[PDB]
Symmetry: D2
Subunit: 140 residues, 4 copies
């Protein structure tokens, strides 16, 4: 479907002693890409949404992650994001990370399908909401 693409440079800080990306970092980039998607789709900043209709953002309730091959500093990553499926209060967000070999070949590094929702904070308690119609439409 509607797919967004953002790039990400691997920094020395991002790798472990074994000298390859430390995994959590992928999550950090994913959460980035995630938001990036929606922004680039026309949804206002959370900051704003929380004031207009109480949406804080989109919490992750589930995720299936897969690490195909290693990466390291200097490598530049490409992250393909798209909405896999719209459920009721949930939605599938797929992201595919890859890197380029100097041969112009593109190698899948990692992939992940994260299941998120749009939520509100009724005080201290986080609560999911029915994916908003308008949202759908912008993302379309």
């Amino acid at each position: 479907a509607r797919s967004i693409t953002m790039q990400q440079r691997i920094e020395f800080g991002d790798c472990n002693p074994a000298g390859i990306v430390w995994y959590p970092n992928y999550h950090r980039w994913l959460d980035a890409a995630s938001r990036n998607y929606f922004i680039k789709c026309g949804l206002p900043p959370w900051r704003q949404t929380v004031v207009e209709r109480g949406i804080v953002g989109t919490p992750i309730v589930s995720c299936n992650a897969s690490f195909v091959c290693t990466a390291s500093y200097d490598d530049v990553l490409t992250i393909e994001t798209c909405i896999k499926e719209w459920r009721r209060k949930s939605f599938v967000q797929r992201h595919s990370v890859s890197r380029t070999t100097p041969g112009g070949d593109v190698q899948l590094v990692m992939r992940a399908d994260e299941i998120r929702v749009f939520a509100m904070n009724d005080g201290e308690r986080l609560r999911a909401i029915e994916v908003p119609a308008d949202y759908i439409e912008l993302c379309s």
Copy 2:
């Protein structure tokens, strides 16, 4: 099976603007717990292993993550680790995160089954190895 348990305090740094743990952090704690397991099982530090038999550590090739309920700073987390299954070159490592309500009730926060391996770095290239026998035994 053989299960290890370690605790983790949520720091203000660990939460987002929405005021709850930022997810990647869970991964960070998981990777911690992961290693903690093996250490507490008697395997020497990677540092050492890489010199004695070239093992750098245990890279993650797969993971299924689930966020049951929110957490925030000050909360103290309990992380239950264990080896779910030994395959050939792979192994299932399960971790269950929970927190305690002042009612002495324990609430599942998040869970994850990560699939890892023991590996070597043949130069620049990461390569998995057959789970080491002795390792098995210590973990038993």
Copy 3:
């Protein structure tokens, strides 16, 4: 003066390819220790303070950092915190990090004096306030 002490274990995630703590992590622990200080001194959680008298927390306006010797995973750090000086709207918070040699010797790893304040968020704008009297007193 009134000094608080908290410990911190170095995780594999925390070190770089060079195999020693990655510096930013120190900051993370410092910010921890920082808050820890106040909590352990009796000040309620920010969460609370922001509702009772609008204090969000204590932003850092300045810091002088010094890295004496290296650290790495497995090492356990000890962080000594105390209020060096109370100014008007500012205050000096000193922290001294050290580790123990198996000889029972304690080696200074790193130190830092961070200058913070107590603040409010008048909408989008962050604003410092006169250190609160009561606070002083608890910290005393």
Copy 4:
């Protein structure tokens, strides 16, 4: 002197509950900018240097940090790096972070002078070296 410039986007992950950049993140970007400088100056990757002449990288022995004004997600940062002074085994690396107001005005966010060195790892022990001549020259 020779000054390098790199940009950095603030991600939701990067901010705290108070809704502004969490400080350690600045350090992360600084360390980035730091390396970026040298790379863009023509020095090969550490990876390489450690094999050719044993240089692992450039550890930080000191830093003076200053936070002028707040930043938050979405903001795009500009980081100006340059070598302030070459000492013997040390060197001053200055970085100036700023952001742009929609008025086309540029506002200093934060600054820092970090004192680094070029080092080697004689086994487990980190040791500084005399800034390398050639390096100087490239950076010039």
